[PDB]
Amino acid sequence: NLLVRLRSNMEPFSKKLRVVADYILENAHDVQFQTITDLARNTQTSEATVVRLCRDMGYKGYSDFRMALAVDLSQDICDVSAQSAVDSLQDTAKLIDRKSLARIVERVHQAEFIGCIGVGASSIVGRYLAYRLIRIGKKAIMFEDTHLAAMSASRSSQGDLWFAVSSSGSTKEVIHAAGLAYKRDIPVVSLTNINHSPLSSLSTEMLVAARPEGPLTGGAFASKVGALLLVDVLVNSLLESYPEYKDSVQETAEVVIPLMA
Amino acid sequence: NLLVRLRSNMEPFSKKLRVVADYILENAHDVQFQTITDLARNTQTSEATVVRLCRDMGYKGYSDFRMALAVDLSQTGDICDVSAQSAVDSLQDTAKLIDRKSLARIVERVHQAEFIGCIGVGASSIVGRYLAYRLIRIGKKAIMFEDTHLAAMSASRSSQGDLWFAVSSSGSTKEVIHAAGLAYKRDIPVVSLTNINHSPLSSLSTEMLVAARPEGPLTGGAFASKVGALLLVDVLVNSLLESYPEYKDSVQETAEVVIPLMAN
Ligand SMILES: CC(=O)N[C@H]1[C@@H](O)[C@H](O)[C@@H](COP(=O)(O)O)O[C@@H]1O
Ligand SMILES: CC(=O)N[C@H]1[C@@H](O)[C@H](O)[C@@H](COP(=O)(O)O)O[C@@H]1O
Numbered sequence A: 001n002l003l004v005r006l007r008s009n010m011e012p013f014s015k016k017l018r019v020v021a022d023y024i025l026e027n028a029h030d031v032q033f034q035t036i037t038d039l040a041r042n043t044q045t046s047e048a049t050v051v052r053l054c055r056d057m058g059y060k061g062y063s064d065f066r067m068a069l070a071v072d073l074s075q076d077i078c079d080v081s082a083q084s085a086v087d088s089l090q091d092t093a094k095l096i097d098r099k100s101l102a103r104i105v106e107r108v109h110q111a112e113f114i115g116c117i118g119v120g121a122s123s124i125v126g127r128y129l130a131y132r133l134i135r136i137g138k139k140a141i142m143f144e145d146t147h148l149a150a151m152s153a154s155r156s157s158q159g160d161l162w163f164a165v166s167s168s169g170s171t172k173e174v175i176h177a178a179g180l181a182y183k184r185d186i187p188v189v190s191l192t193n194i195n196h197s198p199l200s201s202l203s204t205e206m207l208v209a210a211r212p213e214g215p216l217t218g219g220a221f222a223s224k225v226g227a228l229l230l231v232d233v234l235v236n237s238l239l240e241s242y243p244e245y246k247d248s249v250q251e252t253a254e255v256v257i258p259l260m261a
Numbered sequence B: 001n002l003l004v005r006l007r008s009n010m011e012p013f014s015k016k017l018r019v020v021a022d023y024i025l026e027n028a029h030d031v032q033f034q035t036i037t038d039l040a041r042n043t044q045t046s047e048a049t050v051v052r053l054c055r056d057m058g059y060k061g062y063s064d065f066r067m068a069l070a071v072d073l074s075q076t077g078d079i080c081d082v083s084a085q086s087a088v089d090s091l092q093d094t095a096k097l098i099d100r101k102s103l104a105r106i107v108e109r110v111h112q113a114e115f116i117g118c119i120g121v122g123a124s125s126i127v128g129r130y131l132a133y134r135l136i137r138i139g140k141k142a143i144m145f146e147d148t149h150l151a152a153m154s155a156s157r158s159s160q161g162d163l164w165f166a167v168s169s170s171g172s173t174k175e176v177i178h179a180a181g182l183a184y185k186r187d188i189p190v191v192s193l194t195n196i197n198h199s200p201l202s203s204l205s206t207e208m209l210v211a212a213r214p215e216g217p218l219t220g221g222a223f224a225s226k227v228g229a230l231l232l233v234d235v236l237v238n239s240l241l242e243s244y245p246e247y248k249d250s251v252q253e254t255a256e257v258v259i260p261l262m263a264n
Helices: A002-008 A015-026 A036-043 A047-056 A062-074 A077-095 A098-110 A122-135 A146-154 A172-183 A198-202 A221-241 A245-255 B002-008 B015-031 B036-043 B047-056 B062-073 B079-097 B100-112 B123-137 B148-156 B174-185 B200-204 B223-243 B247-257
Strands: A113-117 A139-143 A160-165 A188-192 A205-208 B115-119 B142-145 B162-167 B190-194 B207-210
Touching: A002 A015, A002 A062, A015 A036, A015 A047, A036 A047, A036 A062, A036 A198, A047 A062, A062 B247, A077 A221, A077 B079, A077 B223, A098 A160, A098 A205, A098 A221, A113 A122, A113 A146, A113 A172, A122 A139, A122 A160, A122 A221, A122 A245, A122 B123, A139 A146, A146 A172, A160 A172, A172 A188, A172 A198, A188 A198, A188 A221, A205 A221, A221 A245, A221 B079, A221 B223, A245 B062, B002 B015, B002 B062, B015 B036, B015 B047, B015 B062, B036 B047, B036 B062, B036 B200, B047 B062, B079 B223, B100 B162, B100 B207, B100 B223, B115 B123, B115 B148, B115 B174, B123 B142, B123 B162, B123 B223, B123 B247, B142 B148, B148 B174, B162 B174, B174 B190, B174 B200, B190 B200, B190 B223, B223 B247
Parallel strands: A113 A139, A113 A160, A160 A188, A188 A205, B115 B142, B115 B162, B162 B190, B190 B207
Antiparallel strands: none
């Protein structure tokens, strides 16, 4: 019925607003999975125009409108769950840009200190990255306290590198912390499931997994599995280009032997 | 080297120890991926016998021995596509292995549970966090601990209506077992999520779900091992959503309340 309201309330809109209004009507199902940056790009308008339209429909902004749009459209298990994750792995392996991956490998190799940022289900992905970095002997820290991450990002200096782990690239405190590093000329690598988002303007490099999240599918295993695959490839490529990291894999494995039963 | 020492220094070993020395000398590649509980079973000897072999050989115990073993063995196309392919094979292997009778029972325990405690360290922290996250999406109270002191203290006072998940590929991590063991001993259900059928943890588990690809001393954290542990988490919560469609209201409401935390 929010569609019914859009058509009905479309009467008073200017040309640019009606372009976006028309776009959303004809692409309702796909817009669930688009960021504000996507919708502005796809309509050839601006983010300011999208927001202005969402406000005219009664909403606080784009995220709020998209949430309503998702609820509006929504109105064997082991094998389906597994197949959906196999598909996303495959799709992600096709999408991976090898040249940006190779630059990212060199950035990590050169980094003295790696900070990672991510909340909600992205906290799982950022944790796996920091663990895998620690396995090869890098200093890495994962923050879900976005206040502490903003404060670290704000004093960041040559030698540091940041990963912003966010499927949507639209999470306010994650973007804020990442942007502080970016504005200081610190490399920021984003791990996302969407090509264009607010975070992309604040990233020096991006890896993109398959299956963008919508309002009702955050944390979906199909979206998270591709993001974890980005982490896996990155650290295995580091291991391949710099075999000396294998000494660290070995030593970190040895020192937790005394922690076994 | 450890393998040469096993060979030559085994003259002085007893028959019982010889059986274990012989099994290892013949199966050494696979022994990397076995728990003390497997080596004992596969040789039909006690875990005490296996330990005695290990210490006779100058190691602290089975895990120390198994680590030297993997290092001793160690001296004998595109990276994206191979890393993705392993994870594919692991997912499909885990899917075929899933015991659907256990899974249905585990779903019902979760449904009944008023409080869910989750325990895991190192790379298993990632799996336990995903579980607690997916629980919180359906409106369950779930806490993930990697502080194993805190996890021990909570488990030790655990009471009717609680349920624990012990996340460990090996089921052999000392402080994780200890905390799971405390709940188990107070008759509170414990569900283990591992990548091995037999382990110290299995004898302290009400139920178990087993992912493919057992970890070895030099492959802890491998994405092909973790990807199947995460698939178990997904299938668990998706079954719940299928049996108890009312959980979809929490999925929606948990999605709604984080909208004001987006940039737009
Ligand atoms: C759509 C949705 O449910 N969002 C919530 C979580 O599920 C999600 O994991 C997290 C991080 O979002 P990201 O920054 O896009 O990964 O954001 C929100 O708390
Ligand atoms: C073999 C190995 O390196 N083990 C280390 C980690 O990589 C592993 O994730 C953790 C928990 O292991 P689990 O309890 O078997 O999951 O134990 C060890 O710190």
